[PDB]
Structure formats: structure tokens, C-alpha cells
Amino acid sequence: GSHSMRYFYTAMSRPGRGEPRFIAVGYVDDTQFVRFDSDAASPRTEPRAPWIEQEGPEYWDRNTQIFKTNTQTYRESLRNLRGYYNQSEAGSHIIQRMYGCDLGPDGRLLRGHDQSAYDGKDYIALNEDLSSWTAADTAAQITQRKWEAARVAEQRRAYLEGLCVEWLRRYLENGKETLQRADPPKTHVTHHPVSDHEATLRCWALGFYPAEITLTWQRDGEDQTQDTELVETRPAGDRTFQKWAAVVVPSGEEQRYTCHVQHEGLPKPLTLRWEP
Amino acid sequence: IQRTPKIQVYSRHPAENGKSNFLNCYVSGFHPSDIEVDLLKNGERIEKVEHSDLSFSKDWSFYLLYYTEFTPTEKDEYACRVNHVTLSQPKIVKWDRDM
Amino acid sequence: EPLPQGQLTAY
């Protein structure tokens, strides 16, 4: 089906506690495959998925150089942003950047992404045309002008349409037994009396990959959006994810409720009920 | 400017007393990224807990998974203790095997 | 594979 590659950079200043930390992690879909941390005893790009290990020393050296250079550049950028906002040298600040490429089920480039945030607020983003910028404010307008002057968009576009897709396609082939395998959720409904006249029905989805899933409750075939407690999808630690949806129902009315489950790994969408 | 963590405490595999498993504390939706997370057994901090590499969601909030090997039993109580700049005091969330 | 160092443009 569809696939993406993303790198996520986080650069965090910490005045009085050394120079800003730079961390980079790389993902294919919901699978992390590399990390780099400037605070590590000996900072180097390290593998985080078995299928990347087969890459040669040149790969690791090249990546490590890129991230070491980025460490320095992001420190400059933090200094620069502090200035753009007239901020004190006393506070900690964070730049985040995410970029990468999306492929459709045919392996074609669907779109590219390059987005940044400052202190968790959108700062600047490469537009879907991979040619123009959206700046959030007059500070980001300075970065925009700087990047417009240095032809940054053209460089990001070439990567996103080229290297990004080429390496994503390589990784997808090298890791095809996991990356191109959808594990369906194992699903069940639990029942927990809350009082004499109400009970919680909880619909569980366990052991699925990728993370994308839809879990809903219906009452008489109508969605219970407002009355459903839906927890955030959470990692199990073995690559898979877990989720549940719960509804409080009148005692005796349990069979009017249906849990509906959609996920890529399923031969067909599931309808479950509580089974006493 | 700041976002408080969501916290879930749960096991990797369905909990079966006397059977080794993994205890997970997933903290998410927080900003900035500095966060303190302990896993507790009967109120006592577990030593040697590992965690994932720092990453973030589409809304720029951070998430981390803290985990350790554990063998659930009938009596033993497990919890996750979280402190963040957004919290006055650490937040304790108990492990509940139905959650 | 990440985006090449290129010219490194700082923000």
C-alpha cells in the first residue's frame, strides 16, 4: 500500500548546561530505523531496525557527517531565532523539523514535506509545490527571505523527488518482510459493571501494524462519537500497537452496541459485540 | 506555550500472573521535551528502565515509551510516575490490567 | 537517507 519516509530533528538549547542538543531519528511508516544524538558518549548514526544494518560503512559515515554538520547548523539557527524574537539568552528553546516523502500504492511520489516549528509552534513550511514557503510570522519571514536567497526550495525539491523516494524504495524492499506486512489487530470486547444500571463495554485492538486504525462504537447502527472514550494508539514495544474504545451502556442494552474495526491487515472489517 | 503529558501504563502482552512480560509507560502530547519518568513496583522506583528515542507527532508534541521487563502477580502494584514543567507535583498513574 | 548537507542554510 502507501508508504512514507520521515526524518524528525529536535534541537534544544539549555543555557548554562552546554551547547544545544541535536537529535535526529528516521522512520519508514511507523518503524524507526536510525538515530543520532549529539549528547551520546561518541555521537554517531546508529541503526534501529534490523534491515538497515546491511548498509555499509560509507552509509554510516556519510549519515554521521550530515548529522554532525546539522548539529552545528541548528545551534546557529537557535541563536538566530532567539534574536528574531528578541528573546533572552536565559531561556531554553526548541527547533523541530520534519521532512520526507510519501509514496502511493504504486510506489509513485505522492507529495513531499518539509516543516519546522519553534517552541512547538509552526514556523515555516515548504508548500506542496516544493517551490514556495509559508512563513508563520515576521520572524519566519526572515528565514524565508534567507532560504529564498539561497535557493533552498530547489535543493529540498531535488532531494524529495529523488534521493528520498529512491532510498525509501530501497528500504521498503530490504525490509519487505516487516515494512510491507500489515499485522491485523486481535480484537475482543470486555464488560465491566459500573453500577446496578450501567456497564462499560471496552473494545480492544491489540498487536496491529501499522498504527493507523479506526475503532468506533455504534448503538443501533448509529455512531457514538461523543459518548465513546477513545485512548491514543500506543506502542506495545514489539513494533505493534494497541488501542481501545469504551462506551458506558445501560445494563441489559449491551446487544444494541457494536464495535467496528478497520485496519489494513484485516481480510474484512470487523463487527464485534460483547459475548457474555 | 506548554503542553502537559498524556500518560498510559500498560503491558506489552495480556497480563498473566507469574508470567514475564513488559511494563510500558507511554507519555505523549507534551511540550517542551524534558520529562522525568519512573516505573514503580509497590511504590519503589524500578532501576534500569529503558526508553525510546525522542520523537514527535504531527502537532509537534513529543512522545516517549519507557519500558522494563516485569512479572505481574496478584499482589504486586505497578505504577508510572511522571514529572514535567507543566505539573506542580509528579503524577502517579497506576497499572490497571483492564486499561 | 537524509537530506544532504548541501550549503547548510541556517534558519
CSV table of C-alpha atoms in Angstrom, one decimal:
chain,number,residue,atom,x,y,z
A,1,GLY,CA,0.0,0.0,0.0
A,2,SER,CA,1.1,3.5,0.8
A,3,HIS,CA,4.4,4.4,2.4
A,4,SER,CA,6.4,7.3,3.7
A,5,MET,CA,9.9,8.2,4.9
A,6,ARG,CA,10.3,10.9,7.6
A,7,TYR,CA,13.2,12.4,9.4
A,8,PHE,CA,12.5,14.2,12.7
A,9,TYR,CA,15.1,16.7,14.1
A,10,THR,CA,14.8,18.2,17.5
A,11,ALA,CA,17.4,20.9,18.6
A,12,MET,CA,17.1,22.1,22.2
A,13,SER,CA,19.1,25.0,23.8
A,14,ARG,CA,19.8,24.8,27.6
A,15,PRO,CA,21.7,27.9,28.7
A,16,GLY,CA,24.2,27.1,31.4
A,17,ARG,CA,24.2,23.3,30.6
A,18,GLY,CA,26.3,23.2,27.5
A,19,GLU,CA,25.5,23.7,23.8
A,20,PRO,CA,22.1,22.8,22.3
A,21,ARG,CA,21.4,19.0,22.0
A,22,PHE,CA,20.6,17.8,18.4
A,23,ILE,CA,18.7,14.5,17.9
A,24,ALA,CA,17.6,13.1,14.6
A,25,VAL,CA,15.5,10.0,14.1
A,26,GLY,CA,14.4,8.4,10.8
A,27,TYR,CA,11.2,6.5,10.1
A,28,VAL,CA,9.7,4.4,7.4
A,29,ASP,CA,6.0,4.4,8.1
A,30,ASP,CA,5.7,3.6,11.9
A,31,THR,CA,9.2,1.9,12.0
A,32,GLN,CA,12.1,3.8,13.3
A,33,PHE,CA,15.4,2.8,11.6
A,34,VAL,CA,18.2,5.3,12.6
A,35,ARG,CA,19.1,7.7,15.4
A,36,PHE,CA,21.7,10.3,16.1
A,37,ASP,CA,22.2,12.1,19.4
A,38,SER,CA,24.8,14.8,19.9
A,39,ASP,CA,24.8,14.0,23.6
A,40,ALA,CA,25.9,10.4,23.1
A,41,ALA,CA,29.3,9.4,24.6
A,42,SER,CA,30.5,9.1,21.0
A,43,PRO,CA,27.9,10.6,18.6
A,44,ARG,CA,27.3,8.5,15.5
A,45,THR,CA,24.3,7.5,13.4
A,46,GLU,CA,23.1,4.2,14.9
A,47,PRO,CA,20.8,1.5,13.4
A,48,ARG,CA,17.4,1.0,15.0
A,49,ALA,CA,15.8,-1.6,12.7
A,50,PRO,CA,17.5,-4.9,11.6
A,51,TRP,CA,17.1,-4.2,7.8
A,52,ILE,CA,19.2,-1.1,7.9
A,53,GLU,CA,22.2,-2.9,9.4
A,54,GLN,CA,23.2,-4.3,6.0
A,55,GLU,CA,24.1,-0.7,4.8
A,56,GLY,CA,27.9,-0.3,4.5
A,57,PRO,CA,30.4,1.8,6.5
A,58,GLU,CA,30.1,4.6,3.8
A,59,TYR,CA,26.4,4.9,4.6
A,60,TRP,CA,27.1,5.2,8.4
A,61,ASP,CA,30.0,7.7,7.9
A,62,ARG,CA,28.0,9.8,5.4
A,63,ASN,CA,25.0,10.0,7.7
A,64,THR,CA,27.1,10.8,10.8
A,65,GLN,CA,28.8,13.6,8.9
A,66,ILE,CA,25.4,15.0,7.9
A,67,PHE,CA,24.1,14.9,11.4
A,68,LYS,CA,27.3,16.3,12.9
A,69,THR,CA,27.1,19.2,10.5
A,70,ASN,CA,23.4,19.7,11.3
A,71,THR,CA,24.3,19.8,15.0
A,72,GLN,CA,26.4,22.9,14.3
A,73,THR,CA,23.8,24.5,11.9
A,74,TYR,CA,20.9,24.0,14.3
A,75,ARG,CA,22.9,25.7,17.1
A,76,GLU,CA,23.4,28.7,14.8
A,77,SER,CA,19.7,28.6,13.9
A,78,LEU,CA,18.7,28.6,17.6
A,79,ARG,CA,20.9,31.7,18.1
A,80,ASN,CA,19.3,33.3,15.1
A,81,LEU,CA,15.7,32.6,16.2
A,82,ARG,CA,16.4,33.8,19.7
A,83,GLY,CA,17.4,37.1,18.0
A,84,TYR,CA,14.3,37.2,15.7
A,85,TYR,CA,12.0,37.1,18.7
A,86,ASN,CA,14.1,39.4,20.8
A,87,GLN,CA,14.4,36.7,23.4
A,88,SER,CA,16.6,36.5,26.5
A,89,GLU,CA,19.8,34.4,26.4
A,90,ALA,CA,18.4,32.8,29.6
A,91,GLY,CA,15.6,30.6,28.4
A,92,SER,CA,15.6,27.2,26.7
A,93,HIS,CA,14.1,26.9,23.2
A,94,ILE,CA,13.5,24.2,20.7
A,95,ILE,CA,13.5,24.0,16.9
A,96,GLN,CA,11.8,20.9,15.4
A,97,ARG,CA,11.9,19.9,11.8
A,98,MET,CA,10.2,17.1,10.0
A,99,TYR,CA,10.7,16.2,6.3
A,100,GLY,CA,10.2,13.3,3.9
A,101,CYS,CA,8.3,11.9,1.1
A,102,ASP,CA,5.0,10.0,0.6
A,103,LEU,CA,4.6,7.2,-2.0
A,104,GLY,CA,1.2,5.8,-3.2
A,105,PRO,CA,0.5,2.1,-3.5
A,106,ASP,CA,2.2,2.1,-7.0
A,107,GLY,CA,5.4,3.5,-5.4
A,108,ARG,CA,4.9,6.9,-7.2
A,109,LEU,CA,5.7,10.1,-5.3
A,110,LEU,CA,2.5,11.4,-3.9
A,111,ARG,CA,3.9,14.5,-2.1
A,112,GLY,CA,6.9,15.9,-0.2
A,113,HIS,CA,7.1,17.6,3.2
A,114,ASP,CA,9.4,20.0,4.9
A,115,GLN,CA,8.0,21.7,8.0
A,116,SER,CA,9.5,23.5,11.0
A,117,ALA,CA,8.3,24.6,14.4
A,118,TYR,CA,9.8,26.9,17.1
A,119,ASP,CA,8.9,26.2,20.7
A,120,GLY,CA,6.1,23.8,19.4
A,121,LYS,CA,4.5,26.5,17.1
A,122,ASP,CA,4.6,26.2,13.3
A,123,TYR,CA,7.4,28.4,12.0
A,124,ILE,CA,8.0,27.7,8.3
A,125,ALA,CA,6.9,25.1,5.8
A,126,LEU,CA,7.7,24.1,2.3
A,127,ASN,CA,4.5,24.4,0.3
A,128,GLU,CA,3.1,21.3,-1.6
A,129,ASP,CA,4.6,22.8,-4.8
A,130,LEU,CA,8.1,22.1,-3.3
A,131,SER,CA,8.9,25.6,-4.6
A,132,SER,CA,7.5,28.3,-2.2
A,133,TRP,CA,7.3,28.8,1.5
A,134,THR,CA,4.6,29.6,4.1
A,135,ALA,CA,6.1,31.6,7.0
A,136,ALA,CA,4.1,31.9,10.2
A,137,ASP,CA,5.2,35.4,11.2
A,138,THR,CA,7.6,38.2,10.6
A,139,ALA,CA,10.5,36.3,12.2
A,140,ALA,CA,9.9,33.3,9.9
A,141,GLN,CA,9.7,35.8,7.0
A,142,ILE,CA,13.5,36.4,7.7
A,143,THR,CA,14.2,32.7,7.3
A,144,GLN,CA,12.0,32.7,4.2
A,145,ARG,CA,14.0,35.6,2.7
A,146,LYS,CA,17.3,33.8,3.6
A,147,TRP,CA,16.1,30.5,2.1
A,148,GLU,CA,14.7,32.2,-1.0
A,149,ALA,CA,18.1,34.0,-1.5
A,150,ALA,CA,20.0,30.6,-1.1
A,151,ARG,CA,17.7,28.6,-3.4
A,152,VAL,CA,16.9,26.2,-0.5
A,153,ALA,CA,13.5,25.1,-2.0
A,154,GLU,CA,15.1,23.8,-5.2
A,155,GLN,CA,17.6,21.7,-3.2
A,156,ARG,CA,14.7,20.3,-0.9
A,157,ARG,CA,12.7,19.5,-4.1
A,158,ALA,CA,15.5,17.6,-5.8
A,159,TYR,CA,16.0,15.5,-2.6
A,160,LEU,CA,12.3,14.9,-2.1
A,161,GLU,CA,11.7,13.8,-5.7
A,162,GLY,CA,15.0,12.0,-6.0
A,163,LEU,CA,17.1,10.5,-3.2
A,164,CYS,CA,14.1,10.5,-0.8
A,165,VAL,CA,12.0,8.2,-3.0
A,166,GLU,CA,14.9,6.1,-4.2
A,167,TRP,CA,16.1,5.3,-0.6
A,168,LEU,CA,12.5,4.8,0.6
A,169,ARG,CA,12.0,2.3,-2.1
A,170,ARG,CA,15.3,0.5,-1.2
A,171,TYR,CA,14.4,0.3,2.5
A,172,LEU,CA,10.9,-1.0,1.6
A,173,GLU,CA,12.5,-3.8,-0.4
A,174,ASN,CA,15.2,-4.6,2.1
A,175,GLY,CA,12.7,-4.6,5.0
A,176,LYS,CA,9.8,-6.0,2.9
A,177,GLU,CA,9.0,-8.9,5.3
A,178,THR,CA,8.0,-6.3,8.1
A,179,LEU,CA,7.6,-2.9,6.3
A,180,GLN,CA,5.3,-4.4,3.7
A,181,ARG,CA,3.5,-6.7,6.1
A,182,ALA,CA,0.3,-5.5,7.8
A,183,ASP,CA,-0.5,-7.2,11.1
A,184,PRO,CA,-4.2,-7.2,11.8
A,185,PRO,CA,-5.5,-6.3,15.3
A,186,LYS,CA,-6.5,-9.1,17.6
A,187,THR,CA,-9.9,-7.8,18.8
A,188,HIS,CA,-12.2,-8.5,21.8
A,189,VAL,CA,-14.9,-6.8,23.9
A,190,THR,CA,-14.7,-6.6,27.7
A,191,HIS,CA,-17.6,-5.8,30.1
A,192,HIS,CA,-17.2,-4.0,33.4
A,193,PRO,CA,-20.3,-3.2,35.5
A,194,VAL,CA,-20.0,0.4,36.8
A,195,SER,CA,-23.2,0.3,38.8
A,196,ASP,CA,-26.5,-1.5,39.0
A,197,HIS,CA,-27.9,0.0,35.8
A,198,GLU,CA,-24.7,0.7,33.8
A,199,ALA,CA,-21.7,-1.2,32.4
A,200,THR,CA,-18.6,-0.2,30.4
A,201,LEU,CA,-18.1,-2.0,27.1
A,202,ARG,CA,-14.4,-1.8,26.0
A,203,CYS,CA,-13.4,-2.8,22.5
A,204,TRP,CA,-9.7,-3.8,22.3
A,205,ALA,CA,-7.4,-3.9,19.3
A,206,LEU,CA,-4.0,-5.5,20.0
A,207,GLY,CA,-0.9,-6.4,18.1
A,208,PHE,CA,-1.5,-4.4,14.9
A,209,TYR,CA,0.9,-2.7,12.5
A,210,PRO,CA,0.9,-0.1,11.1
A,211,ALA,CA,-0.5,2.3,13.7
A,212,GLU,CA,-3.4,3.6,11.5
A,213,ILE,CA,-6.7,2.0,12.7
A,214,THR,CA,-10.4,3.0,13.2
A,215,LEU,CA,-12.2,1.8,16.3
A,216,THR,CA,-15.8,3.0,16.8
A,217,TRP,CA,-18.9,2.1,18.8
A,218,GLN,CA,-22.4,2.1,17.3
A,219,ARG,CA,-25.7,2.0,19.1
A,220,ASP,CA,-28.5,0.6,16.8
A,221,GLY,CA,-26.1,1.2,13.9
A,222,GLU,CA,-25.5,4.9,14.8
A,223,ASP,CA,-22.0,6.2,15.7
A,224,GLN,CA,-21.5,7.1,19.4
A,225,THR,CA,-18.7,9.6,18.8
A,226,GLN,CA,-19.5,11.9,21.7
A,227,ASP,CA,-20.1,9.1,24.2
A,228,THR,CA,-17.0,7.0,23.2
A,229,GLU,CA,-13.8,7.2,25.2
A,230,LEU,CA,-11.0,6.6,22.7
A,231,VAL,CA,-7.5,6.3,24.0
A,232,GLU,CA,-4.5,7.3,21.9
A,233,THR,CA,-2.9,4.5,19.9
A,234,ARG,CA,0.1,3.2,21.9
A,235,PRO,CA,3.1,1.1,21.1
A,236,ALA,CA,3.4,-2.3,22.6
A,237,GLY,CA,7.3,-2.3,22.3
A,238,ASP,CA,7.4,-5.2,19.8
A,239,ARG,CA,6.7,-2.9,16.7
A,240,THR,CA,2.9,-3.4,17.1
A,241,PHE,CA,0.3,-1.0,18.5
A,242,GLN,CA,-2.7,-1.2,20.8
A,243,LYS,CA,-5.9,0.8,21.2
A,244,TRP,CA,-9.3,0.7,22.9
A,245,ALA,CA,-12.7,2.4,22.6
A,246,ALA,CA,-15.1,2.4,25.5
A,247,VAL,CA,-18.8,3.2,26.0
A,248,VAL,CA,-20.9,3.2,29.1
A,249,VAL,CA,-24.2,1.5,28.4
A,250,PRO,CA,-27.5,0.8,30.2
A,251,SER,CA,-27.4,-2.7,31.8
A,252,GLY,CA,-29.4,-5.0,29.6
A,253,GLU,CA,-28.9,-3.0,26.4
A,254,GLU,CA,-25.4,-4.4,25.6
A,255,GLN,CA,-26.5,-6.1,22.4
A,256,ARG,CA,-27.6,-2.8,20.8
A,257,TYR,CA,-23.9,-1.9,20.7
A,258,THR,CA,-21.4,-2.9,18.0
A,259,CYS,CA,-17.7,-2.2,17.9
A,260,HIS,CA,-16.4,-1.6,14.4
A,261,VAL,CA,-12.8,-2.1,13.4
A,262,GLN,CA,-11.0,-1.1,10.2
A,263,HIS,CA,-7.3,-1.8,9.6
A,264,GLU,CA,-5.1,-2.7,6.7
A,265,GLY,CA,-4.2,-6.2,7.9
A,266,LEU,CA,-7.8,-7.4,8.1
A,267,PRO,CA,-9.2,-9.6,5.3
A,268,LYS,CA,-12.5,-7.8,6.1
A,269,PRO,CA,-13.7,-5.0,8.5
A,270,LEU,CA,-14.8,-6.4,11.8
A,271,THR,CA,-18.1,-6.0,13.7
A,272,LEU,CA,-17.9,-7.3,17.3
A,273,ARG,CA,-20.3,-7.3,20.2
A,274,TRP,CA,-19.9,-8.3,23.8
A,275,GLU,CA,-20.1,-12.1,24.1
A,276,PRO,CA,-21.2,-13.0,27.6
B,1,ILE,CA,3.3,27.6,25.1
B,2,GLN,CA,3.5,24.4,27.1
B,3,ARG,CA,1.6,21.1,26.8
B,4,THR,CA,1.1,18.6,29.6
B,5,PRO,CA,1.8,14.8,29.1
B,6,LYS,CA,-0.8,12.2,28.5
B,7,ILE,CA,0.2,9.0,30.3
B,8,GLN,CA,-0.8,5.4,29.7
B,9,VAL,CA,0.6,2.5,31.8
B,10,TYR,CA,0.0,-1.0,30.3
B,11,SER,CA,1.6,-4.3,29.5
B,12,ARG,CA,3.1,-5.4,26.1
B,13,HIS,CA,1.2,-8.8,26.3
B,14,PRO,CA,-2.0,-9.7,28.2
B,15,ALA,CA,-1.1,-9.9,31.9
B,16,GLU,CA,-0.8,-13.4,33.3
B,17,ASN,CA,0.4,-13.7,36.9
B,18,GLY,CA,3.7,-15.4,37.2
B,19,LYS,CA,4.4,-14.9,33.5
B,20,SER,CA,7.2,-12.5,32.5
B,21,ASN,CA,6.0,-9.6,30.3
B,22,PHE,CA,6.9,-5.9,29.7
B,23,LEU,CA,5.6,-2.9,31.7
B,24,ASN,CA,5.1,0.1,29.5
B,25,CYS,CA,4.6,3.8,30.3
B,26,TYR,CA,3.8,5.8,27.2
B,27,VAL,CA,4.0,9.6,27.7
B,28,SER,CA,2.7,11.7,24.8
B,29,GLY,CA,1.4,15.1,23.8
B,30,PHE,CA,3.9,17.1,25.9
B,31,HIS,CA,6.0,20.1,25.2
B,32,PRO,CA,8.8,21.0,25.9
B,33,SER,CA,10.6,17.7,25.7
B,34,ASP,CA,12.3,17.5,29.1
B,35,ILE,CA,10.4,14.9,31.2
B,36,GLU,CA,11.0,12.6,34.1
B,37,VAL,CA,9.5,9.1,34.1
B,38,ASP,CA,9.9,6.4,36.7
B,39,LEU,CA,8.3,2.9,36.8
B,40,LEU,CA,7.4,1.9,40.3
B,41,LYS,CA,6.9,-1.5,41.9
B,42,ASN,CA,5.0,-1.2,45.2
B,43,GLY,CA,5.8,2.5,45.4
B,44,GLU,CA,9.5,1.9,44.8
B,45,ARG,CA,11.4,3.1,41.7
B,46,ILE,CA,12.5,0.3,39.3
B,47,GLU,CA,16.1,0.5,38.3
B,48,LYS,CA,17.4,0.2,34.7
B,49,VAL,CA,14.2,1.2,32.8
B,50,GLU,CA,14.8,1.9,29.1
B,51,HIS,CA,13.1,4.3,26.8
B,52,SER,CA,12.6,5.0,23.1
B,53,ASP,CA,14.4,7.8,21.1
B,54,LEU,CA,12.8,11.2,21.3
B,55,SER,CA,10.4,11.8,18.5
B,56,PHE,CA,7.3,13.9,18.0
B,57,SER,CA,3.8,13.8,16.5
B,58,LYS,CA,2.3,15.9,13.7
B,59,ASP,CA,1.2,18.6,16.1
B,60,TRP,CA,4.9,18.9,17.3
B,61,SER,CA,4.2,17.3,20.7
B,62,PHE,CA,6.7,14.8,22.0
B,63,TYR,CA,6.3,11.1,22.8
B,64,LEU,CA,8.4,8.5,24.6
B,65,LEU,CA,7.9,4.9,25.6
B,66,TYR,CA,9.5,3.8,28.9
B,67,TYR,CA,9.6,0.1,29.5
B,68,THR,CA,11.0,-2.7,31.6
B,69,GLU,CA,10.7,-6.5,32.0
B,70,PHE,CA,8.2,-7.5,34.7
B,71,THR,CA,6.4,-10.5,36.1
B,72,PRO,CA,2.9,-9.5,37.2
B,73,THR,CA,1.5,-11.2,40.3
B,74,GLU,CA,-1.8,-11.0,42.3
B,75,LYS,CA,-0.5,-8.6,45.0
B,76,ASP,CA,2.3,-6.5,43.4
B,77,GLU,CA,1.3,-3.0,42.5
B,78,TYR,CA,2.8,-1.2,39.5
B,79,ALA,CA,2.8,2.5,38.5
B,80,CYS,CA,4.3,5.2,36.4
B,81,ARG,CA,5.5,8.5,38.0
B,82,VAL,CA,5.7,11.5,35.7
B,83,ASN,CA,7.1,15.0,36.2
B,84,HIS,CA,7.1,17.7,33.6
B,85,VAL,CA,7.4,21.5,33.8
B,86,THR,CA,3.6,21.7,33.4
B,87,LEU,CA,3.0,19.7,36.6
B,88,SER,CA,3.0,21.1,40.1
B,89,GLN,CA,3.8,17.7,41.5
B,90,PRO,CA,4.6,14.3,39.9
B,91,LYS,CA,1.6,12.5,38.5
B,92,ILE,CA,1.2,8.8,39.6
B,93,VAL,CA,-0.8,6.6,37.3
B,94,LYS,CA,-1.3,3.0,38.5
B,95,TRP,CA,-1.1,0.0,36.2
B,96,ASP,CA,-4.6,-1.4,35.7
B,97,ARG,CA,-4.7,-4.6,33.7
B,98,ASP,CA,-8.1,-3.7,32.1
B,99,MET,CA,-6.7,-0.5,30.7
C,1,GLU,CA,18.9,8.6,3.7
C,2,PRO,CA,18.7,12.2,5.0
C,3,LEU,CA,19.0,15.5,3.1
C,4,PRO,CA,22.4,16.3,2.1
C,5,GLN,CA,24.4,19.0,4.0
C,6,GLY,CA,24.5,21.0,0.7
C,7,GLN,CA,25.3,24.6,1.7
C,8,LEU,CA,23.9,24.4,5.2
C,9,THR,CA,21.4,27.1,5.5
C,10,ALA,CA,20.8,28.1,8.9
C,11,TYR,CA,17.4,29.5,9.8
